[PDB]
Amino acid sequence: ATYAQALQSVPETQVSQLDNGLRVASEQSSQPTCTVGVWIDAGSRYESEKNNGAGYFVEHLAFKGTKNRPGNALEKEVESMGAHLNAYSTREHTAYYIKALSKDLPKAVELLADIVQNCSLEDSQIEKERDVILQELQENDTSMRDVVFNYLHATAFQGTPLAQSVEGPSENVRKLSRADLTEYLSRHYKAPRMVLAAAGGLEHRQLLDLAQKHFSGLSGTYDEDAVPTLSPCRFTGSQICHREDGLPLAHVAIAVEGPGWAHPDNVALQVANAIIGHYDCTYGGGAHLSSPLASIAATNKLCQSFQTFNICYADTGLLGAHFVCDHMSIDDMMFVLQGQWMRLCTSATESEVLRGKNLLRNALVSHLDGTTPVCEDIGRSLLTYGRRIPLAEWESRIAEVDARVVREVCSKYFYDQCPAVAGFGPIEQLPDYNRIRSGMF
């Protein structure tokens, strides 16, 4: 078949909803294994300065025992059936998911229901996790990449909830109480804020009945005065430079404000980012890479690596790049990078945009490879778009992009716009903000 007919053969994702508001979505395949999980509209963007880190603390407690399965009982059950239980928290979403044999879907759904509704939160466990989290904060401090990205959010979204890290400040970790957590939970873990998603060898009808059976008790009301809604987050052209000449390589992240999840412009932006691409010293292409930034960097040894990114949030986002380089290569790297954004705004060619479109097509499909990536796409999509966008639609959106669309969309977000800049390490050579700003036009 052609790439076109193959697109129309992907089973359509089935979506249902319970009385309490919980959405149930699934994509059936014939895999003897599956992934099922709960995606929640909860994250640090929903936290205030007082409880920032609450969600991450809960993630630490989620698998430590439930009222029905105290202590390591939940753990033993997951392990004995050979399943895998994982979780993650971001500034807007939280997810708990299980990879298991398709025949074990009923127990998998029960366990998730149990986890999301009956978490013990034993005072002694809370004290133990407190120390674990503090140690994780210390470890994260050694990850220059994680530090620079937290810094980018701190400065770009300064004064708003998006400026907050997911883990929260250490003093919050030392002071968060069970009361704080149960409070956070009663407020955010409601059925209308959750999506039960599954992908693999199972039928929607079976998942739906299991959901009715195990999630019906989940609250779908809350009230009116306590319905955590999101306010837009102001973006600020600014710079944060943490100079540390003791570190061997400098990390720099720069971005302009992105449009947010729902905007159609994200497709063209993804095409443009694909044109500039990514790179690191282990890439075999070197001097022949198609991206001018990549080949210049490789032939002139300008950096160890770089990556463009389009981080999306509800109504805003960070569109830009991150690079790692020697202290004497920062200005050159910034010069070439900004020159490439400007070239795309004013002179993107049909041939490079086609390449970008093909890169995006390949990335889209190769990403949805396996029950876990698919299940995550279902969960997240339902939370963000309110629907699963089919591949055939993505193709239509990508197809609509041409050189004209790329120049116009890039001009809209990059041209003469104030960026947010974060630097960490031996950054004496990181350009002054005025010089960076002038580089935007």
Binding site: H242, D432, Y433
Partner: protein, 48 residues
């Protein structure tokens, strides 16, 4: 002794009008650029 008398004064008026315009504008450009430095804040976080 000074046949250029009337003309220098006419030119003088134009010079004053032009400087009255350009000086405040260039000064605004100066303040604009320097604002990045004038409002910057520093923090010293040595490991302890």
């Amino acid at each position: 002794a000074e046949p250029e008398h009337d003309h220098r004064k006419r030119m003088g008026l134009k010079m004053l009008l032009m400087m009255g315009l350009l000086l405040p504008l260039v000064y605004a450009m100066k303040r604009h650029k320097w604002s990045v430095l004038k409002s910057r804040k520093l923090a010293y976080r040595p490991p302890k």
